[PDB]
Amino acid sequence: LYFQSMETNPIPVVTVQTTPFDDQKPGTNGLRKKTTVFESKKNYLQNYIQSVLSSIDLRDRQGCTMVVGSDGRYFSRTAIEVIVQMAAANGIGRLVIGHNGILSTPAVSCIIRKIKAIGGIILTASRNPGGPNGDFGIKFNVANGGPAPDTVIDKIHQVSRTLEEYAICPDMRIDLSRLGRQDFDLENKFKPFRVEIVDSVEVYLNLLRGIFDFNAIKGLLTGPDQLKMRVDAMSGVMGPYVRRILCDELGAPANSAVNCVPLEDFGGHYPDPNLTYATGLVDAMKGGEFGFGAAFDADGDRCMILGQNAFFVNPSDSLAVVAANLSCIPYFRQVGVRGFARSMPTSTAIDRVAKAMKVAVYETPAGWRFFGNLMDSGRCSFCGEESFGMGSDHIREKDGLWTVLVWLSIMAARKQGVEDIVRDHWTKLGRNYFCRFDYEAIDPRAAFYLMKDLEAVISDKAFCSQKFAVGNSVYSVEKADNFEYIDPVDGTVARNQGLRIIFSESSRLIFRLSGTGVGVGATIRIYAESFERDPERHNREPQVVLGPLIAIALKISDIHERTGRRGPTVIT
Ligand SMILES: O=P(O)(O)O[C@H]1O[C@H](CO)[C@@H](O)[C@H](O)[C@H]1O
Ligand SMILES: [Ca+2]
Ligand code: NA
Ligand code: NA
Ligand code: NA
Ligand code: NA
Ligand code: NA
Ligand code: NI
């Protein structure tokens, strides 16, 4: 098929010889390194961008569209520039980029799916700190808008470890500050290379408007009896989303929007929503003047929900509560509820809802990528993780602001505050007490032998006959395993996904090695769960209830001696 056209000042395409790197395999949620690795290690960033681009069939990449966005952290604008120069050189037809480089992770997923893009690159290190001395990360999402599957992660890795050259258009300059279209004539490309700078919020907001009853939510946030609300974006990507959606569209006063200017260092604070790091929000909620509080992580897919007086909504309870109240949402009234999913370490509170509702519930490895197949196949429409994550099949990522809007929708439909809804839920279904200990940046050698030895302990043929006593508490082993998951849709097998001990007395211990590290150090997470049926025992301190289970965990793992630590780095 023949065509003729004109070109003006075509941008040359440069081929650069390079040496492969050894460690360019992404973890659970992207390739995460210290920022200085991407910024200063020669060709480190270019090698990985080329490897990502090369995991796309050359015929499927010619004339395709990719979405690019960042959480705003230091080095994002430089990475975006390089990404645009390299996408142009590798024959990508069009890039859709958020205004000023800003696109939340839920917005990227939404836009990929909406415009049928082949995929997306999200520049974020999630809850990790930003700045020149901070962390930087590169996520790759595929055509369903969800994280890259193990199939694609391996293709990226084998391209990165053997890469010998990459292509780039170094003379290209892109203005992220102006909305609209920018076309570029490239040498040896017939069609112009197209860049669209899009409003960070508009298309994502349009999706949310069809899921939720915005009139109902607006009624809750306005008028004389209005909900008093504090929403902390932690100086990350969610700033403009909060202001445009919760304030402008839904009527919340401007003082509801806290830390809603994106900053390259997130204001010098960890953009991590929990009681340990969202101290500014907790302190304001403790004052008693607000009925609802929320904090988001850097890229807007995590959310902590607080009630009046900083009542803490455990993320595993958030999952169960919302699951039991999906009828309050227009979306789920129309399309129904096909199934639930949680990660294996997440508490089994949602399983009790699924049983009562006669709905399937799946148990996946940690990480949102495993919910993608469940949603695509229609097996599941609502899912969550203990790590402050919740989402639905509206996209293929977790979604913090969606979590806020579904909670407000439930509060409006039930005419109840946060704490009353949760306690009413506990009264109906019982309470699953739950906590997580993080042992951060421990020696990888120590972690290896710890997990190896513990696996041998819990896999011994006599372990299911064991029982443990701490004080007056007794726990009897029902089952134990090294969790594996065979994807029911595409057959991907994920092994070594957590050491799990299930006790007969409605209790669990889970041990996992982290897969989202940046540097050398390893992180071990211990999860403890205990179910309480008695409604008079639903106001105890979780660290008291779970004390004995934690004692057993620390003893059989020997973690304190093996790591030199006296206790966990973080408690959730
Ligand atoms: O470091 P980990 O435990 O492998 O992974 C952690 O971050 C992931 C990416 O946000 C979450 O999906 C997990 O639930 C969380 O535990
Ligand atoms: Ca037993
Ligand atoms: Na040209
Ligand atoms: Na700083
Ligand atoms: Na079902
Ligand atoms: Na109430
Ligand atoms: Na993480
Ligand atoms: Ni995140």
Numbering used by the authors: -5 to -1, 1 to 567
What do the study's own words say?
PGM5 shows a bi-lobed structure with four domains arranged around a common active site, forming a deep cleft between domains I–II (residues 1–195 and 196–308) and domains III–IV (residues 309–425 and 426–567).
The structure contains all 567 residues plus five residues from the N-terminal His6-tag. The complex structure closely resembles apo bPGM5 (RMSD 0.267 Å over 567 Cα atoms) and represents a closed conformation, where loops 0 and 4 form van der Waals interactions to fully close the active site. Based on the location of the highest peaks in electron density, we conclude that bPGM5 as in the apo structure has a phosphorylated Ser121 in the active site and that the observed ligand is G1P instead of the G16P that was used in crystallization.
